[PDB]
Write a protein that binds this DNA or RNA. Structure first.
Ligand SMILES: [Ca+2]
Length: 976
DNA sequence: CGCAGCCGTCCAACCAACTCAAA
DNA sequence: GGTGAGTTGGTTGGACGGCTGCG
């Protein structure tokens, strides 16, 4: 081939690592540990009693393939050549081609020029509607950056643009390493343009050199090593972003059409021996050969692989957590389920097994009954053969989407550690590209218990359902079984990691039980994936933000806003510089008068719009605004000690304000269609409106993150300053206008029915970041739910400006304020809401958890306890030491007395009082020694001097000093 | 009877182990 | 990616108060 394929298509030799337990009639002395040594035969697969080599492609293969090429052999049917008109892009790659490298391919001159002598090529990855895999390579996208003309001319004595091209070329030749060679001024194109720096209102338009560069590597050097005295603009912008922004309409995910170019040129199909990727067909084109295909929105037949690995620790402890760098800690099985992402149908069930494995009739009957495919079990003699066969599947079937549970944190890191460290397989050919592609995992950072990681593989969207579900569903435990019982309501089986070595050693039937359990977990995760449809959300954000779905997952929130801002800033002639290097506090207490929550709809975005906040409307200096009129043409605001100014929208409209304005218009338009739309559309529209929400809410954070892409702490500080002043204005208005019931009634004549017995008062009692809680003494809760909408409306007219809206969320009938962001309350509908508090403690026993709930539930649902709890707030805490406790709390005390009785009673259901831990270590002293579970294992409290199981959970219950348990532990301390 | 020394008790801070959470 | 797991429970050290001994 023209570019070498770097994945394995042939293999004669490998490091054979396999458990000695797989050898039949081995004596017990040999039936332990692993073989580890080289073997000189082809890697091999056994399936249903047939054998094939792993890397043999042809008829009879034990797993499906969607690969045209294998090791440069074209396995397409004779004369295969599908016409491509429309195709759906899901991911975009950017790579440097060199005309010299491609000289043996049959490419037209108009492509060769765009890579002469080098150039970035954008590769669109997709399917046709018939399910043919396509790559379209787009030529001609130069990256570019700007520098101020007067600073450049003065700094390095340039007269005309080709001088700057020579200066940059020289700065490449003279690099500290030999990293840039073959350079000329022609690697650059430079032109003079007029632009304005995005920062500050006073800033004049100036002449900049816009410099075009052929490679992101060349750019990254000039934007760090060349004239660092001169500030640079948009040097961090990648070729993908330039491609998406420079062509109106274009998207990183969606349907496209091939079409004639400006000189009636066409896309050129590549020959098979010139393919860059594992695709059925490939094309060269330029961006004028492309258009969006409007009216297509159905996803094509992409394939999803859901996978899960089982591992067995092979060292001195068979029950320790396995470590990939220890050769003897093996991958023993991999379940791999292949779905069609468009129909949601499970198409294949593959189980890779080290050692023979016979799946149970029970399991095979259950799958057949559920209508699912019959599993193919693939058996391997060694761990290398298995990992190579899984990676061979990944390259040959090429699943566009991959999922699993903790696949980023464990399964991929363990596999790729094994493949790179133990075995020495180059991963750069195992993605969509045939070599030199990204295939990498990395650790997030200093996070020691929560080991967390990211992955990028070219052309493969990794979505981990652990990430999706932790980001969505509030749960006590995120173990996959706990999630299956919570989300799918489905009580599936367990096999412990402690059971696995005992099962694995027994024989093929017991290794089958490991298979059943492994398959079943991948099925649960597939069902979770197609419940949440997370690809549709990530797709929606990718389309909206103008970034690929890969960056949508693995990069932060900032790049989303940055890319949108960059498009808009360009339209308006701005350029973005490359970044260098209290009365609201709750008096805690219990309220039995209704509490209305007012809450600002999207406070920070609505402030940004209302007050026209932006980089480009800010000023720090009065002579910037001395020609304008105060209050009319600009806002003045003291923020963090500085006097900031922001010109109002009719002087200059904020770029942030325009982004937010336009997004919220789209969100309305979509949500207006949802009730009319067909149920297939209704889910898509729901994903679109959700994508817009997360992008809007990220604007505030984007400005506030220092050393971010485009920071402006003055805007973030003004947003939060205005937010604080708005909450106090809300409090002052509410207190001043509605001091007396008559004033409320004059504004809302409904209040005549609402009026409850006793004194009327209406006071703010808590104020969050963007909500206010109003204690409505002397009003009934029922009508107050409705009057709150009209109050919130009236406040939003009297105060504030048209993008800002205060809304009535909810009415508590009873509320316990505990602290900032901690409260419990019962809503008017009877539902209890708990915020910032856990009433069940994970380390406590059932007796304590249930009794804790009983006390809180009684405070909220017994009005006698509620009223008496309100009476407590009449006095300081110390005075209730002297005075008798208020009448009505006796029923609350009664639950404590009852629970106390139930400790020291016969017929104590001891099972409610069982604490628990798993011993895990060896059972002797360590440091702290007296760990309860050790003294109910080793120095056993109640019973004989040893306990059978070292790695499972010790149940234990505390008991009285008795001159019997004392003697037991005090003598066991001597036995020791 | 007063003062000094020693012992006991209480409080605060730090360190270690468990938990998921993958096996 | 910047903060460390939270959490608790046990152990050690320091301070304060009370009782006993000595002058
Ligand atoms: Ca997993």
């Amino acid at each position: 081939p023209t570019q070498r394929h770097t994945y394995y298509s042939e293999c004669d030799e490998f490091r054979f690592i396999a458990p000695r337990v797989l050898d039949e009639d081995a004596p017990p002395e040999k039936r332990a540990g692993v073989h580890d040594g080289h073997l000189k035969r082809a890697p091999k697969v056994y399936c249903g009693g047939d054998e094939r080599d792993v890397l043999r492609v042809g008829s009879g293969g034990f797993w499906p393939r969607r690969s045209r090429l294998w090791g440069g052999v074209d396995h397409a049917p004779a004369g295969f050549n599908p016409t491509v008109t429309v195709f759906h892009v899901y991911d975009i790659l950017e790579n440097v081609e060199h005309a010299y490298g491609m000289r043996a391919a049959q490419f037209h001159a108009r492509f060769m020029d765009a890579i002469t002598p080098t150039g970035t090529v954008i590769t669109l990855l997709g399917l046709t509607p018939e399910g043919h895999r396509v790559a379209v390579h787009v030529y001609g996208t130069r990256q570019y950056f700007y520098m101020n003309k007067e600073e450049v001319d003065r700094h390095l004595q340039c007269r005309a643009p080709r001088d700057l091209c020579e200066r940059m070329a020289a700065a490449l030749r003279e690099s500290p390493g030999a990293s840039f060679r073959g350079i000329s001024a022609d690697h650059f194109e430079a032109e003079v343009v007029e632009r304005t720096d995005v920062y500050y209102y006073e800033t004049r338009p100036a002449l900049f050199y816009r410099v075009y560069v052929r490679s992101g590597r060349v750019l990254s050097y000039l934007c760090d090593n060349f004239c660092p005295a001169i500030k640079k603009y948009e040097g961090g912008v990648d070729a993908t972003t330039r491609f998406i922004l420079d062509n109106p309409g274009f998207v990183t995910f969606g349907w496209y059409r091939l079409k004639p170019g400006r000189n009636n040129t066409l896309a050129q199909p590549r020959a098979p021996m010139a393919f860059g990727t594992s695709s059925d067909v490939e094309f060269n084109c330029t961006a004028d050969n492309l258009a969006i295909e409007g009216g297509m929105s159905d996803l094509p037949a992409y394939k999803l692989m859901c996978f899960d690995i089982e591992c067995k620790a092979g060292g001195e402890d068979e029950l320790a957590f396995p470590v990939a760098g220890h050769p003897e800690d093996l991958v023993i099985q991999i379940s791999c389920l292949l779905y069609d992402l468009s129909t949601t149908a499970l198409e294949h069930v593959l189980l890779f097994s080290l050692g023979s494995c016979d799946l149970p009739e029970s399991h095979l009957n259950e799958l057949a009954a559920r209508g699912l495919p019959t599993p193919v079990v693939l058996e391997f003699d060694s761990e290398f053969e298995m990992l190579l066969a899984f990676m061979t599947l990944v390259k040959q079937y090429g699943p566009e989407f991959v999922t699993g549970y903790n696949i980023i944190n464990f399964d991929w890191p363990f596999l790729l550690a094994k493949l790179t460290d133990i075995y020495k397989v180059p991963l750069d050919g195992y993605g969509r590209m045939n070599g030199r592609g990204v295939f990498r995992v990395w650790d997030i950072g200093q996070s020691h218990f929560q080991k967390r990681s990211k992955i990028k593989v070219n052309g493969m969207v990794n979505i981990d359902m652990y990430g999706i579900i932790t980001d969505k569903i509030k749960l006590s435990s995120y173990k996959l079984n706990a999630v299956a019982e919570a989300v799918l309501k489905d009580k599936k089986k367990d096999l412990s990691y402690r059971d696995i070595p005992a099962y694995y050693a027994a024989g093929p039937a017991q290794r089958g039980v490991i298979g059943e359990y492994c398959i079943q977990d991948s099925l649960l995760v597939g069902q979770l994936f197609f419940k949440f449809l997370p690809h549709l959300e990530l797709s929606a954000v990718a389309r909206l933000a103008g970034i690929n779905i890969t960056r949508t997952i693995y990069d932060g929130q900032q790049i989303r806003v940055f890319t949108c801002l960059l498009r808009l800033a360009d339209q308006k002639g701005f350029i973005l510089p490359d970044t260098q290097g209290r009365v609201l506090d709750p008096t805690s207490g219990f309220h039995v008068n209704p509490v209305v929550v007012f809450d600002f709809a999207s406070l920070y975005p609505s402030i940004i719009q209302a007050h026209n906040l932006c980089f480009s409307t800010l000023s720090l200096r009065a002579d910037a605004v001395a020609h304008l009129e105060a209050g009319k043409d600009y806002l003045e605001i003291e923020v963090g000690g500085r006097r900031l100014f922001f010109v109002k929208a009719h002087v200059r409209e904020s770029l942030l304000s325009i982004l937010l304005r336009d997004w919220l218009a789209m969100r309305k338009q979509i949500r207006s269609r949802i009730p009319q739309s067909s149920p297939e559309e209704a889910v898509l529209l729901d994903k679109q409106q959700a994508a817009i929400k997360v992008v809007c809410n990220s604007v505030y954070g984007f400005t506030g993150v220092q050393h971010g892409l485009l920071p402006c702490l003055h805007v973030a500080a003004t947003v939060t300053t205005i937010g604080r002043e708005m909450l106090l204005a809300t409090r002052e208005y509410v207190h001043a206008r509605w001091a007396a019931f008559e004033q409320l009634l004059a504004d809302f004549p409904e209040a005549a029915d609402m009026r409850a017995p006793g004194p009327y008062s209406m006071r703010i009692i808590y104020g969050d970041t963007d909500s206010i809680f109003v204690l409505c003494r002397g009003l009934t809760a029922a009508g107050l739910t409705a009057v709150g909408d009209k109050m919130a409306s009236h406040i939003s007219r009297a105060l504030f400006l048209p993008p800002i809206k205060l809304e009535c969320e909810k009415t508590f009938t009873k509320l316990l304020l505990i602290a900032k962001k901690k409260y419990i309350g019962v809503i008017y509908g009877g539902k209890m809401l708990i915020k910032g508090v856990d009433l069940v403690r994970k380390n406590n026993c059932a007796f304590i958890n249930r009794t804790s709930r009983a006390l809180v539930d009684l405070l909220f649902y017994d009005d006698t306890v509620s009223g008496a709890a309100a009476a407590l707030a009449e006095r300081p805490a110390e005075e209730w030491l002297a005075r008798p406790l208020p009448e009505g709390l006796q029923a609350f005390g009664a639950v404590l007395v009852d629970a106390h009785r139930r400790i020291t009673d016969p017929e104590r259901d001891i099972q409610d009082f069982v604490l628990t831990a798993e011993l895990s270590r060896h059972p002797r002293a360590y440091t702290n020694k007296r760990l309860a579970h050790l003294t109910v294992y080793y120095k056993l409290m109640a019973r004989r001097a040893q306990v059978p199981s070292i790695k499972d959970r010790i149940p234990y219950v505390i008991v009285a000093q008795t001159r019997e348990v004392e003697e037991t532990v005090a003598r066991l301390a001597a036995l020791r």
